[PDB]
Design a protein around this ligand. Structure first.
Ligand SMILES: NC(=O)c1ccc[n+]([C@@H]2O[C@H](COP(=O)([O-])OP(=O)(O)OC[C@H]3O[C@@H](n4cnc5c(N)ncnc54)[C@H](OP(=O)(O)O)[C@@H]3O)[C@@H](O)[C@H]2O)c1
Ligand SMILES: NC(=O)c1ccc[n+]([C@@H]2O[C@H](COP(=O)([O-])OP(=O)(O)OC[C@H]3O[C@@H](n4cnc5c(N)ncnc54)[C@H](OP(=O)(O)O)[C@@H]3O)[C@@H](O)[C@H]2O)c1
Ligand SMILES: NC(=O)c1ccc[n+]([C@@H]2O[C@H](COP(=O)([O-])OP(=O)(O)OC[C@H]3O[C@@H](n4cnc5c(N)ncnc54)[C@H](OP(=O)(O)O)[C@@H]3O)[C@@H](O)[C@H]2O)c1
Ligand SMILES: NC(=O)c1ccc[n+]([C@@H]2O[C@H](COP(=O)([O-])OP(=O)(O)OC[C@H]3O[C@@H](n4cnc5c(N)ncnc54)[C@H](OP(=O)(O)O)[C@@H]3O)[C@@H](O)[C@H]2O)c1
Ligand SMILES: NC(=O)c1ccc[n+]([C@@H]2O[C@H](COP(=O)([O-])OP(=O)(O)OC[C@H]3O[C@@H](n4cnc5c(N)ncnc54)[C@H](OP(=O)(O)O)[C@@H]3O)[C@@H](O)[C@H]2O)c1
Lengths: 297, 297, 297, 297, 297, 297
């Protein structure tokens, strides 16, 4: 049974606690937070919560449920302690570089790191790889939403006159996305100004963006999300092969569960850093291989 | 470039030829048939066709496009020659045992074998594994068709009074399948009896079966097929996670293309036998890993 | 404009009245009924209604909106008067013979008859013909409903213990249909007996049938109906060509409109009898061909 | 059997070869190409290939699988030799005029010509005509794709800084289409300039267009295509009649098969030129009419 | 049995007549029109038609099928006569104020008024309320069409050079709508200018608008319409609850039927004015409550 | 702010705790359980838990999250204490009688009771009522699943030789349902026996039932569920009006949230007992009516 720690008790972190507790081959040693207040969250009543992973006895693996930009530093800190790490780093543009950066650190400390192990990047990545070799010629389209965007939401809220905001990702089709922004204005903030400020912002200038002022943004929030991946391609020399994959899921819940499966896999790999398509899928399953082969193949 | 041979020029074999010719990292050395007639099929005009793989110079990998029951003997024959092998062996209840049987043969002759590498078993198996770890609790349903059934058609054609027949697999839902049989009666035969013999045959006795007599079975044949895989499960402790995968494809065309990708992967493994869920998905992709990670993850 | 008469003021007849009035190239001369009561239906207030088509001056075409079994004698009666005729005779197994029977009658009296011109048989027939030549090899499935069934309902009301009944046609998929019967029992009739008689009747004996006793059958009546026609076949030697046609329509409304278009075509044909697939489609369109070619091709 | 020749061995031509070989009522006499090299394509090994149709003995019909702008001269050349002709000329705005031009040429040489016989124009045209008379009032929407666009792709390759390109037709709904262009730039060409030139070109100027630079255009090519035709209209005076037709097919494969069926019909017509809606649908079916009436109506 | 009068014999009024005649608990006393010509519409032959509701003996309820702007004055006129009233007033931004305006008028004359009782506002409003309390946090999207737009069509028809026009409402998703305008130009008018005047008009300036010139607008008219309402929200603290409601209906037919049900409810309320969400749903059903509870709950 | 108690800390009870805590107009006073163990569930750490509702100060309303058969006694016990009550009693056959039984008890103690307030019975009941008056003639079909059935599951588990079981409700279409049973056998229990015992049981004899033996039933459980309600009917005299409502939700989560909304409504009613269709929908919404009318109608 793998001794694991949840690092970062945020949205994903809260679901990670549950995923670890539900895992048959793992034991939750504790949670690592930046601060630990006297008032204990109800669900953490019988859970060890500290600020230093060192105080969690025999930790073998860590789920890095921290902000994207904090992942690099956290992974290196855990790896240098010989602790296997998993994160759902979501920047497609440079996770490949993150992989090269963490590989030597992981190896030199006898640990394994699996990066970008959420649903996208993550499991969606595996699916895209499958579609790619099943029909080498053609185009795969990944359509996200409806669901909220963390990055886009923060960007809008950082605008003067904006008390709080919600940015919805809407699938327009063929891999194109539009934005539906909902904003809660400050004292005498002018909507027109805020509206153009949003549409102009580099985060929305590239896509069709619509803005709406609301009384309460919190009243509109839901972490449900989804994706539709499609490919029309050529298998060998045979055209029009049609594939479609769709999910309607709780975003953080799925991410945390995939992270758990990835940490299970990490503990079984040779020291180094890996993305999800570099690990045999059976390594994400608990227990002996034989039974899974008979049940799933 | 991997030198490959197509063994068995049947339905899948014909597509395998095309899949190999289209692969950027493979070279088709030739085709192995039980017999080679003087009348050369048009598309094989510039292709080396022989009855013994030994006559195909420098073959490194073999695509075993032979009947399911012939796979075991063919795989051992090729492996004992040090030739990597791929097959799409389709018996879910026995493939695990085939794996154990071929493992030492492959290993002792420095070769790798990837078995059951079609779409089901095969790629569908990978998808089922993903759904399984993304939402550990729940049920996955695999719905096949509409499409023609392998053995079912032969089973009916073996009935007295049946000139030729076609058995369609029809999805009834919840992983249950119906059978739509089309028969071309032999001069004199009685439909009523044939209809009874079919519905009572062990091959159909367990599923809803409907029989129809037709003037020509050939006029009804189409190798298109498909599948709908669904799962409603729990990620961690979060219920109602919804997943759906569907494809509408040319059956043998997809199978042959997956076999090609699997052979590419086999050549990159340690000697032994593997099912598709025991191989990192990136090994099914041609060339350098880096490029694929940046493109797909 | 073509002078037309509506024969039989029933369900389809009521809609035919409207279809003719809306046609830009036709003039409604009148309606022919078995009897004409003193109480005139509101919508027929300004319409000539008689018991003999001879009383309708200059009639050139007749829409035979009479029961299926009455069509043969009605068509011969009209044709022998030199009047073009259209009907939506719905017996697929007898259709061809009706064509042979009416052909010489129509020809010898210088008139044209278009039979079975509803949506099925009728327009669905044309679609089936199209799918057949677009992909010669494969299977076309015609799935009807949900919608009320003609004879099935009358057949149920035929049993003694039934005051009124409604038989719904339910698509089970792959061309198979289920029956949902609703019955209003006579005071004292046993439901169990009726339920048994229904499922036993040769009208439901070979189809999954379910019975439900209801307070009022009239409260469940709706003339909406539909169809889904699908085909997965081979174009040339290319497999898995996928086609799908679906309609959700008012049954008698569509039937009456198709009959109108067919009568327009009939007036354009050489004397004789025709099914809808024996007439160029442009003949079903009003006016000059040139305009339609530019608008539709 | 009708003796037929395939003129133009391009995309559609390659499929036409197969469609003719599979036709039960036709005999492939040969293929006519602009040039015949010493290296014979494998599939043409046992086929007569020449540069002048006169070298193909007893040819009665010709499938003109040449570029759109070449159809007029090719059709007149064949017709003046008394050879029936079929083409899938795709310009909706000129179609009618081509018909007028070829009609007297066909007639004076005792031959029949069926123009624009692909799926659109072609079979889609018949479907549009059906929907039009089934519900005279309303609007029919024809939504194409996803699939590759003919001229659009060549038009993009027309710009200087483009080595190769692919233009995808994307259905935006309600008969509106979007463009997804993929370009492979020449060493040194500026993407910004190309992107601008594309969106500016009169081919995309009036449609939402998006451009993406790609490593390889060939790796994105797939000949699959499709259409969704819908109409909500009035049958008689009854509103909201709903119709829907959809296809997911191999573009050239379907086009070639329709051309074959149209040539069969042409040989059955009085000398002159016809579009597909001017021919009874049963004429597109092989053999005796009686059998088809019983099987399809 | 409630004695009812239909006020305004327009689109909705014509259906209201039928809805009242079909209601088991209502008696149609007559129709109130602005003028009554000597030429009686066929369907009104046995119906009392007058210009003053006072001539309709014992009227207890009135269905106000008049233009939106006329509703206020008509409702106050009927209420001041002690006659219960129902209207489908469609202005979402002002109906709350209409409610406050009519409340004291209805109360002081012992009558009840139910306003905005169509499908939207109306039944859609009830559905939105249900979704709102079933999942308090999240967003509900109401997508209309395809279907003809009320004011939009009139707004275009008021443009110089426009003989007649039709404005189609097209759902773009996420509660956003597109406009497809069809215009029939007056002899001489310039399309380019009309097209500009339309797209710039306040009625379309906020949505994507496309204009098309046609020979006949009447040939494109169909009163079918529809809606798709969706919500992804949080029930309690559980995210991703998914809801979807859709209908494809005859617009005025449904509106008139809902108005009838609302009038039935009005007659059962304490004097005052009500929107549809202020009435228990069982009050919209005819007769005794007990029977409905057993049949529907 | 309404002071509320959750009675019964089971599946629904656990979600009810969350729904009350999330409600803006309610205050959770505590939870009433049959027993209170020393080991406190983490999430109940800061919550008052007792065995007698009397120990919860100032309780005004109670959510009866107890077994169906316990509802009658619990409701009467709470009502006799002057506490408003809500339950999701799910027996369609006699909830009408429960209503008559609780009405006088509620009234005589100055309290209000809203029974059967889940999604079915409950919100689905409201939807069925709407469809009923929008189109009075026709048939509404309620299709449940996929999702688990509590009753059916218990019935199977009570069978000798059955360690544990799971009964899935599968929609077969048109209001017909099939059962997919999963069983975990005891020591030497014979499957064949258990299988027929299930198929024979009155709980499954009425429907198509399939049985499967599994290693672990708990590994297959998920509380997700759903429904598809459809109606094709007549509005007035206009046929083929089409309606569809679908939900994919967490079963207990939705039920608890609806119960909260119903308790809010109960507190606003005259003393007595009500089903959900007897309460204006706006009463299920928190706060003043004005704002909801403007936001939703
Ligand atoms: N790949 C995917 O498919 C996918 C999908 C969804 C999310 N994700 C990843 O999941 C990450 C976390 O998501 P989330 O919604 O859980 O974020 P979150 O709610 O903000 O949680 C992050 C937690 O880390 C700690 N933290 C906060 N700010 C920090 C900082 N500035 N420096 C160091 N630690 C900080 C806090 O926990 P304590 O208070 O306990 O310290 C905080 O609650 C996302 O950023 C994204 O990268 C990936
Ligand atoms: N896993 C999947 O998803 C999946 C899907 C589809 C198919 N498959 C597998 O693919 C296998 C082959 O399918 P297929 O349609 O290509 O079969 P096929 O058409 O019968 O071709 C098999 C070929 O094997 C060669 N052969 C060698 N020994 C033979 C023998 N004893 N009897 C007959 N042929 C023999 C023949 O080619 P020569 O004449 O050249 O010797 C024959 O044409 C299937 O049996 C199945 O196991 C798997
Ligand atoms: N092909 C299709 O797609 C399709 C679809 C729907 C219907 N149809 C055909 O069209 C027929 C239409 O029937 P319907 O729905 O309009 O209702 P119906 O009850 O068949 O009405 C037929 C009318 O024919 C007249 N009539 C003459 N002889 C009659 C007789 N012997 N018995 C009863 N009526 C007689 C009556 O009008 P008067 O009182 O004015 O004499 C009667 O109302 C269907 O039965 C079927 O044959 C075809
Ligand atoms: N809430 C919804 O979901 C919804 C949906 C659809 C429609 N509606 C409502 O239904 C209303 C009526 O729709 P409609 O299509 O029936 O309108 P319409 O066709 O124009 O009919 C309105 C009738 O009102 C009478 N009338 C009285 N004063 C009039 C006036 N000042 N100008 C013109 N007519 C006047 C006329 O009948 P006489 O000639 O007999 O006097 C006229 O035919 C719409 O305006 C809208 O408010 C609501
Ligand atoms: N209408 C709908 O749409 C709908 C849908 C779903 C469920 N429901 C209703 O919700 C009800 C409860 O569902 P559930 O899944 O929460 O059931 P459950 O998990 O068994 O919870 C019932 C709770 O009541 C107490 N209890 C158990 N047995 C009892 C008994 N024999 N006598 C008195 N109290 C008992 C227990 O709480 P303590 O241990 O705290 O005492 C138990 O946890 C269902 O029975 C059904 O009627 C309705």
């Amino acid at each position: 049974k793998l001794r694991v720690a949840v690092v970062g008790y945020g949205n994903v972190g809260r679901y990670a606690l549950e995923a670890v507790q539900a895992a048959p081959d793992m034991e939750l040693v504790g949670v690592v937070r930046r601060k630990v207040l006297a008032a204990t969250p109800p669900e953490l009543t019988g859970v060890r919560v500290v600020t230093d992973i060192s105080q969690l006895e025999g930790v073998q693996g860590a789920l890095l449920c921290v902000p994207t930009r904090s992942v690099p530093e956290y992974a290196e800190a855990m790896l240098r302690r010989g602790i296997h790490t998993v994160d759902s780093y979501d920047i497609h543009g440079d996770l490949a570089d993150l992989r090269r950066r963490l590989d030597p650190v992981a190896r030199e400390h006898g640990a394994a790191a699996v990066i970008s192990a959420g649903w996208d990047p993550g499991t969606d990545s595996i699916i895209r790889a499958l579609l790619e070799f099943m029909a080498p010629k053609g185009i795969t389209y990944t359509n996200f939403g409806p669901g909220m965007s963390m990055g886009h939401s923060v960007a809008v809220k950082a605008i003067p006159g904006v008390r709080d905001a919600l940015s919805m990702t809407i699938p327009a089709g063929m891999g194109v996305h539009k934005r539906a922004v909902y904003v809660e204005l400050e004292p005498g903030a002018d909507f027109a100004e805020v509206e153009r400020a949003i549409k102009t912002d580099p985060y929305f200038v590239r896509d069709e963006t619509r803005v709406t002022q609301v009384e309460s943004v919190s009243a509109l929030m839901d972490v449900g999300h989804g994706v539709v991946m499609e490919r029309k391609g050529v298998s060998g020399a045979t055209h029009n092969q049609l594939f479609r994959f769709e999910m309607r899921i709780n975003n953080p819940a799925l991410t945390a569960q995939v992270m758990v499966a990835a940490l299970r896999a990490a503990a079984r790999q040779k020291p180094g850093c890996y993305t999800m398509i570099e690990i045999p899928v059976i390594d994400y399953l608990p227990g002996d291989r034989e039974a899974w082969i008979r049940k799933l193949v």
